[model samples]
Target: APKASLRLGFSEYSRISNLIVLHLRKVEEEEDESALKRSELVNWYLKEIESEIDSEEELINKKRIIEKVIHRLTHYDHVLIELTQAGLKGSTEGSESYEEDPYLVVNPNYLLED
Candidate 1:
């Protein structure tokens, strides 16, 4: 059976992502450098949070890290999608391919907030 909290986590993460995407789109036309910096920060934060998620054995810590990543990445996904779309237009690699990789698979319904 699925955990009850996962649904809440998923919903919260989705809302967070929506806000982040909106913010990114709003700032995209104003300053290129700022957008880029934000993108880099998001990537760095994601990676760091991912490391923490990997090292933690406790479920609570793992959930917390996941929520943090979701919040951080939500803000950066607009930049990421734009960058990815530009770079992958002519390349064989694609975002969908990455999503399908076994190592990337994680709990889709896991909840981070108590």
Candidate 2:
């Protein structure tokens, strides 16, 4: 039989993405740089978490990381928002085509949290 695809349920997706937006926006405030797009920020989150997941030797930590990564990936795949500067508003620059290449930015309108 074909292996089941990994993905997040709606609530799980919402919760995870909410935290991601919250945390990422905090990162933006700390870094004090230009606003970041949803896709690029999520890609960074996934890759960095993946690196930690790989480096971890403990099964428990690995298991949790894998679960979180799967959810994060699912959210990244589906989100389309394009908020600017954590202001809870859409970007004036508007949507960019970031979904065609490698990490599929997916929808650029469902940007992350405030």
Candidate 3:
């Protein structure tokens, strides 16, 4: 391997976390192959390896954030974000305040379904 290459870019409009997703492929390969590349590679590895999954908290956070993004609503992560933004503004209030706010609600209303 002549030094495998990859690229990543990270940006944050809210000055938080700044996570990024990496999707890369070889320059010599056709773009169409990428669709199968990831799946086949993962499937091959998964067959020979015993990989463990994450704790519930990560899954919980992932699902909630995705729901918020899809529906333009708020969730636990949003509440955390607001708390940080408020604190940055020098407000005496803290995380607990957000935990109790009416604005920090789950869209689709898990309870008493909409």
What's each prediction's TM-score? 0.28, 0.28, 0.21
The lDDT of each candidate is 0.41, 0.43, 0.28
- Per-residue lDDT of model 3, residues 1-114, tens digit only: 562332332111111111101121331143321221122333433332223225656445444433333233233223222223432333454434444332122212222111
lDDT of 1 by residue, 1-114 (tens): 355566434653544344445444554556322232233444544554465454445335444544576454445432233334422342443435343222121122333333
Q: Distance (Å) between predicted and true CA of 9, model 2?
A: 4.3
Q: How far is 43's C-alpha from truth in model 2 (Å)?
A: 1.5
Q: After superposition, how far is residue 43 of candidate 3 from its true place, in Å?
A: 18
Off by over 4 Å in 2: 1-11, 31-34, 51-114
Taking every candidate in turn, the Cα RMSD to the unseen true structure, in Å, is 11.6, 11.9, 18.8
Tens-place lDDT per residue, model 2, 1-114, is 262333543443454455455554665578632244434554565555565454445434434544554455456544523333322233344434352222222232333222
Q: Candidate 1: where is the Cα deviation over 4 Å? A: 1-9, 33-67, 70-114
lDDT of 3 at 28: 17
**lDDT value, candidate 1, whole model:** 0.41
